[PDB]
């Protein structure tokens, strides 16, 4: 039925199940697993075919193949590497990377004899222990002990040259999310940041800025002109107004431009606020002239006006908000998204909304080992393709033949990955100036607590006190007491114990379901109906509007709670004050479990507690607990619009009326503490500075750091 005054046992049993199923380092393990399983295949597949010529030569890559880690001894005999041997001999723990090259030849004589170079070696990918592609996976206690590897070791680290290196998650501004900021001193009054990128596969982040000119030069007609709106497009040296850009997208009718910018035509205040841009753009009236204008101010001005037109079209096509679409005919989506962008800017201008806080961890994500290795592999693969292209051109200008076996240089990927993972200069070796440092620190091994704390660690890119202060967002999300005492205090933080980082998934099934579920796509839509309906976002990109918000919310939540086609890791938002439904699926989000609450009672009933208490020989665990729709993954974004209960028996039971619509209930309040801060007894009774100091020491508290020390 229910769990009255038995809550201690129930909560600690469910936490037992959670830690027995997942563990402590699953963020690293799952990130790397997803990287190896999908990111490498996506990166290699989504690469430009190599075309060169006379006969035409085309090369296309194919499925990735991986094998267990091996050592290429001097005699050349393959030998399964072992983590112990890797540590002792200063041998990098890695496995070869194999691909299939399809060499298709065209001699302009129907001589297409395609040859498939199956299993072509291209480099060595470092492999991190206890991963599904490591050699320790699945071994029980007996084999691990027999193999001279500690059973208690959480793994989650690489081995380069015998030094155990561990990747540290890095914070960055969340991609594909329009922000608004108010620079205090800058010539722009308010500005809008929408750092955006495609689905973590094609090109790094490209930023679009939109801003408002501050009131200046008064006394003259400048005040009569008023505040003008300006945006600095990517790959454009200087700034440019907005309506000119909108006309560059191909929409000339000022009625249509205001329809895009404005959803309700009964707001004279905002009409007057946007009028200055209309007056400014009264000299540009056609698409071609606007394209010439924007292209004329690029880094390399075109030789002829057709050259400026082509450059402007290219930059507005590929480098302009890639996440919304780069499929040529997607100009309407770009136009609508820019309209929403400037609409949010105007709403910030009029004070109807409020400026988004930069240091709000619901507005930034964590680059885990997966995405970081994906970025490095992207760079190294581009370098390898360039090397192959130049080698092929040089060797075929003679015109004799071509050989892929010798053309491909496995040296480049292996050394690039090894170097970047070893010394921490994250990027190409020659470009250390622009390469972010501090990544892949040496694993700390003074104590088991130290090792776990180092595995579960974040880091900010900052070298002012605002970024380095604790924030409300970090409740149960990052350890509050823990932080380094030194100069890096605040920037470096450890995850909460129950915290779980989003490995990531694709948005295809969500878009399919939404499109089927009586949602109007954002092309065959009447513009006038936008205001009265609710917007929809999937990883930022606007995809349509819906007129039944709560029904859609209930359906999506029901699907998530059952692991239907929508993945459990996904979260969905509803800001009713703004009429939006934000759905996020990209990796890098951070999340924690919570208990669902319906009506006023927990869905966690005595039967679930009994089953979990009998977890052994019952094939019932945390995943099966989530199967019954009892515990729900609520990330920081979704925490923004829910209500939590500290303890059911204290809050859920009726009392003097304070709240009666608790949507979720905490697993246990103590879970907010981190690894090193958890061992503190009675941390509440202590003063927080001394909790912090002790949390620093727990790394330095010596002991039996690992069982197999000898």
């Amino acid at each position: 039925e229910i769990t009255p005054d038995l809550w201690q046992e129930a909560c600690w049993i469910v936490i037992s199940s959670y830690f027995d199923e997942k563990g402590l380092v699953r963020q690293q393990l799952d990130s790397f697993d997803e990287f190896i399983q999908m990111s490498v295949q996506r990166i290699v597949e989504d690469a430009p075919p190599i075309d060169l010529q006379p006969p035409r030569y085309l090369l296309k890559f194919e499925q990735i193949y991986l094998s267990k880690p091996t050592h290429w001894e001097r005699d050349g005999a393959p030998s399964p590497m072992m983590p112990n041997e890797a540590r002792l001999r200063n041998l990098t723990y890695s496995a070869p990377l194999y691909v299939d090259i399809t060499k298709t030849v065209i001699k302009e004589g129907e001589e297409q004899l395609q040859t498939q170079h199956q299993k072509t070696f291209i480099g060595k990918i470092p492999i991190m222990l206890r991963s599904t592609y490591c050699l320790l996976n699945g071994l029980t206690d007996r084999d691990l002990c027999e193999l001279n590897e500690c059973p208690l070791d959480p793994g989650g680290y690489f081995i380069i040259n015998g030094s155990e290196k561990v990747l540290i998650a890095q914070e960055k501004m969340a991609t594909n999310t329009v922000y608004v900021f108010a620079k205090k001193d800058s010539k722009y009054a308010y500005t809008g940041e929408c750092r955006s990128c495609l689905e973590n596969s094609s090109r790094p982040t490209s930023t679009i800025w939109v801003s408002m000119l501050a009131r200046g030069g008064q006394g003259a007609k400048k005040s009569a002109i008023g505040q003008r709106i300006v945006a600095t497009l990517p790959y454009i040296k200087q700034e440019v107004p907005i309506i000119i850009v909108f006309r560059a997208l191909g929409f000339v009718s000022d009625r249509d431009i205001l329809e895009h910018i404005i959803y309700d035509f009964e707001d004279p205040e905002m009409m007057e606020m946007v009028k200055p841009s209309l007056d400014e753009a009264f000299v540009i009236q056609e698409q071609n002239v606007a394209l010439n204008f924007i292209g004329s101010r690029g880094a390399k001005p075109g030789v002829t006006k057709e050259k400026r037109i082509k450059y402007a079209k290219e930059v507005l096509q590929k480098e302009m908000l890639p996440h919304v679409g780069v499929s040529d005919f997607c100009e309407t989506k770009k136009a609508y998204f820019l309209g929403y962008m400037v609409h949010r800017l105007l709403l910030a201008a009029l004070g109807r909304r409020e400026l988004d806080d930069r240091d709000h961890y619901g507005n930034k994500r964590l680059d885990l080992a997966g995405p970081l290795l994906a970025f490095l592999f992207r760079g190294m693969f581009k370098n390898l393709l360039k090397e192959v292209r130049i080698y092929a051109q040089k060797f075929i200008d003679r015109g004799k033949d071509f050989n892929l076996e010798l053309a491909i240089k496995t040296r480049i990927i292996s050394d690039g990955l090894k170097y970047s993972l070893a010394t921490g200069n994250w990027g190409d070796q020659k470009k250390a100036h622009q390469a972010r440092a501090g990544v892949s620190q040496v694993l700390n091994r003074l104590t088991f607590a130290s090792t776990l704390s180092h595995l579960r660690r974040l880091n900010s890119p900052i070298g002012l006190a605002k970024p380095r202060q604790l924030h409300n967002t970090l409740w149960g999300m990052v350890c509050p007491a823990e932080t380094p005492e030194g100069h890096a205090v605040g920037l470096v933080k450890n995850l909460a114990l129950m915290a779980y980082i989003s490995v990531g998934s694709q948005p295809s099934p969500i878009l399919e379901f939404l499109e089927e579920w009586s949602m109007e796509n954002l092309e065959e839509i009447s513009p006038a109906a936008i205001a009265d309906a609710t917007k929809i976002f999937v990883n930022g990109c606007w995809v349509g509007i819906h007129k039944d918000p709560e029904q859609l919310m209930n359906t999506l939540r029901k699907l998530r709670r059952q692991m239907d086609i929508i993945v459990s890791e996904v979260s969905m938002i509803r800001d009713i004050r703004e009429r939006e439904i934000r759905i996020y699926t990209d990796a890098g989000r951070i999340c924690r479990p919570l208990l669902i609450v319906e009506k006023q009672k927990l869905l966690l009933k005595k039967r679930h507690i009994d089953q979990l208490k009998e977890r052994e020989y019952n094939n019932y665990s945390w995943q099966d607990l989530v199967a019954s729709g009892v515990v729900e993954y609520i990330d920081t974004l979704e925490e923004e619009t829910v209500m939590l209960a500290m303890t059911p028996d204290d809050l859920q039971e009726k009392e003097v009326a304070y709240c009666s619509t608790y949507t979720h209930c905490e697993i246990h309040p103590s879970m907010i503490l981190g690894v090193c801060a958890s061992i503190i007894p009675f941390p509440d009774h202590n003063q927080s500075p001394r909790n912090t100091y002790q949390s620093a020491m727990g790394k330095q508290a010596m002991g039996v750091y690992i069982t197999n020390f000898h």
């Binding site: 009625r255 035509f265 004279p268 007057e272 004070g351 109807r352 409020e354 009713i576 009666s660 949507t663």
Partner: protein, 114 residues
């Protein structure tokens, strides 16, 4: 008061007067379309913004789980003796903390302040 565009040229219109008949004749400047000004008003500006937020509070905020809920202050059109309250939270609109109430019936939504 508002803004009008063409009838046949889909373009925005400025104000103008008639030199002969002395009447405000909204005339297209990009084209040659004109009409008489029934409103006879050209410009309005409420800098201090007396306009209360009630004109733009959305009704569906009532079914937001996270807002408070108060039993008193029943709705007018329907009794429905339980509703929600929340501050303006609108910078520069007004410096008055007057609580805004909205009824929480499935089809109601009559809003009021007191």
């Amino acid at each position: 008061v508002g803004i009008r565009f063409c009838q046949e040229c889909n373009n925005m219109l400025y104000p103008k007067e008639d030199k002969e008949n002395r009447i405000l004749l909204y005339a297209c400047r990009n084209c040659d379309y004109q009409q008489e000004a029934d409103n006879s008003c050209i410009y309005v500006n409420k800098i201090t913004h007396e306009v209360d937020e009630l004109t733009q509070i959305i009704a569906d905020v009532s079914q937001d789980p996270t807002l408070p809920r108060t039993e008193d202050h029943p709705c007018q059109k329907c009794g429905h003796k339980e509703a929600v309250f929340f501050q303006s939270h609108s910078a520069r609109a007004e410096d008055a903390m007057r609580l805004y109430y909205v009824c929480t019936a499935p089809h109601c939504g009559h809003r009021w302040t007191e």
